[PDB]
Amino acid sequence: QCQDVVQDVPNVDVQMLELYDRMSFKDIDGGVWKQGWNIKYDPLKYNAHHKLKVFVVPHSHNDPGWIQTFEEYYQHDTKHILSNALRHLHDNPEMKFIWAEISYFARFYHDLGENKKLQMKSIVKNGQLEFVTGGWVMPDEANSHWRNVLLQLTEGQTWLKQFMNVTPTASWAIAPFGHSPTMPYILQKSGFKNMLIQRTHYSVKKELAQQRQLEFLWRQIWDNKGDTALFTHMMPFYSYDIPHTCGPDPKVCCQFDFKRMGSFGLSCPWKVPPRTISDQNVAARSDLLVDQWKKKAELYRTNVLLIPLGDDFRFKQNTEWDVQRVNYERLFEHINSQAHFNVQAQFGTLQEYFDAVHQAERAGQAEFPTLSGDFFTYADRSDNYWSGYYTSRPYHKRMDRVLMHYVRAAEMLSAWHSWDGMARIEERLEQARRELSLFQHHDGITGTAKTHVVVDYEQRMQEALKACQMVMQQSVYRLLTKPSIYSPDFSFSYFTLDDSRWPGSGVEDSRTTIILGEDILPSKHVVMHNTLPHWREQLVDFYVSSPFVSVTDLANNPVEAQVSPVWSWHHDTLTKTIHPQGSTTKYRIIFKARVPPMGLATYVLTISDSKPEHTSYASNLLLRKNPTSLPLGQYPEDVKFGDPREISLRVGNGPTLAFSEQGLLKSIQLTQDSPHVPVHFKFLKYGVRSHGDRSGAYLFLPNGPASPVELGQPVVLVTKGKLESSVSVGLPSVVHQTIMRGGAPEIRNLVDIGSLDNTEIVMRLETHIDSGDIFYTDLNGLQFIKRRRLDKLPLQANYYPIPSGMFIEDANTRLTLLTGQPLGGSSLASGELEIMQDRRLASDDERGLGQGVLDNKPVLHIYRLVLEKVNNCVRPSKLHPAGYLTSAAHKASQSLLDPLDKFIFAENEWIGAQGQFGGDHPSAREDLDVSVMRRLTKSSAKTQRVGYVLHRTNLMQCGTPEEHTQKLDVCHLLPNVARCERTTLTFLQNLEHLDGMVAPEVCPMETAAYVSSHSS
């Protein structure tokens, strides 16, 4: 019996949307704890029979790229930190240290000699060095897709299991800029028992501290029973550095950071330095320190206190290890010996802290509150909300989503077979997983790194894309060639990938033309891959060197096709207009590909001397005053011209779209009879303040509501075809395109902010929909959370991450915008949606980056726009904190994130070609996905193992019967199954041995992992 994720509102002690509605968010001076209050404690609370247990946990925050590249930091800092940790921990058995970033640890460990590897394993086994989380990175939680959060977690933990024989069950996330419930969701399904967070809004820290609700059982917003709950510790103060981790007064705590006495080039901003601990000062020093600890302890419910001891790239110098250790040892010896303190203090690890907290809990000493919700948008002080990084460096945010899909497709396509080592499949896939995993870092996908570091991430991701292409095309060639003919050269390109949306038209001329001709080559095979576990039809397009091309399947059945020109937009620096030019030698052919679940389908493109029977030609209409001619070579339809005017289009029996004379949507009519529902696209601009704090890579600090972009009299191009129609317009900084293929439109924006300094370009949708102050945005592509616009907070506080979609609705109507890239957005007034496209900022925003954002480059953003009637849908109650997509919106999101892959055969003739793969694969219910298929064993293993991650979303019931689908049992996808086991999501622990070797499908909103074992 599945939990109902719609109709049962969970009863939790703290529900973050409710808390937000009630809180005042006043920013008052609290004294030494600037954002809190003067903490008081009863000195008699602790006595001989009830002592305060203090764990001082040394740590070093190591960014895998930020102000330097990964490799620069490794050479200049991290390799020294790890080498000196090994020495100092070895030599000082009571000293402890925690480590989070496995990318660096793997980088270090593989360069060690065997003697040192053994010493390292010994300090891990004995518990002195403890891994926390164990992901490749400490990821961003706002822009990251859940699939990539899982990918990087798995990459780090798989390394740790293999080399260190440990799997962390406690997570440490001190640095991401706000926190998502997607983390406890994944962690709890990956064996975790505890997690720690830090960067939450200062007003939230104060509110929860006042109620001693900083430790809580964090469950998902829809979880009525609580089975998703994960114990979470929120740190109370402004920073994770030493001045903000000993207690509420940083002027005091800074005196206990022994790296700040002068020789290290560090000091205390509060103007009182640390002093070396001696017998003559230890009593006074201890009195000050214990007083800070007892104040911090007032904020929590047990007698066990966590004191982190660290900062960025700490514990480098041998002298630094000594200065911190020897001074703390003198403090501990004094404090622990003076009964009047009633304290036992020691170095500890994160797990030791949590174990002691839960021991106290079981002793009946505390009960913990339940909580649901998220912790966006973060503000660290005053009105400084960190909503800028939801958009910064949008080219690379888009690249993340492209690479996400290519990693999935490469792992899936190659999983079907075992490969010889000489094929280098495992090598290429490990590289691709690791570069994508690295980019999940909270300075990677966030767009908060220095320019040269962004370039490094981009180069790494480009290499990863090439690796995925190589693995994919080798796999296609194996899956579709007669086995007794197959003769692979593992270095050769049998196919090249054709991608219509990355980097994109107008971004890079990267696509190959299929060159056909009577005197060269009459025809070409192309292959589509469908990574989703259901049959899919989708229009696909290729560039071809003639308009006279027709399409067949590999039974030689004709397939209806449409040919259109190849249009490119040019900023004519002579005429000062932006206008399209057509190619006279290449054309686009478009046709519907029908592809099996997790399968492949082959088609053939053939040239003829004249218009083929089954190919039609789009009309083209250029709307502008003072047109000039647009010749198109052999294209059989002449371009038409007109003055700008409103126009309407309808493809198939789908919606009718109306456009303004400037080429922007104005209305959607769902059916023949229905109203033309106002739905109006508009581009606006935000600026930057001329006084006070400046927007930068992290912060969005607008100088008021956005102002309309002045459009002039833009050139509009209308292409009308039987299969696909479009309206494209060259606006200042944006070539905006609305594409119609018979269902929800697709929007593409080619965004080039050029040299517009101190500008943020936003795309807004204006409707009539009576949404009031409510809107919905997603978290990590996993779930939709209810948002309430709060006029008591500034504009930038009402911006949230849009990692994959957002919607507004009233009783009758919903408008959903799905995205192919994470961007920031909001609903700033009833009936509106808006999403930021790019931002160019001249100033640094005082968070450590030390530059503006002046490295913008053209990016092609993609979207789907779904207007729907929802009066018949079974929706959650008004008090439920979640929302859910319809079938059409979810399919539209899948169309953006996991499109069909397209392969063009490279050579002239493909001997032994086959027409299809996977025609016998089950076509699963629309709400179920095989998020991951990964072969886990190399070819030398007697018993092959294949891992699957299944995810089931939850779609609204709206009265569409949508019938008969087949059960998907992933354990029988490969033959000769000998065992099927449910595992943690990282595949690292077996949870259940499955009867009949059958992997059951999962419940709505659940994710499960299975591993099948095969004897042949």
Ligand SMILES: CO[C@@H]1O[C@H](CO[C@H]2O[C@H](CS)[C@@H](O)[C@H](O)[C@@H]2O)[C@@H](O)[C@H](O[C@H]2O[C@H](CO)[C@@H](O)[C@H](O)[C@@H]2O)[C@@H]1O
């Ligand atoms: C809030 O500013 C923070 O400053 C530190 C600078 O750290 C270095 O100087 C300090 C102060 S004397 C030393 O004690 C340290 O050991 C270092 O040498 C930044 O490194 C820190 O960065 C963190 O937050 C930013 C966002 O503000 C992230 O982008 C980054 O990933 C990191 O987590 C911060 O700038």
Ligand SMILES: [Zn+2]
């Ligand atoms: Zn960091």
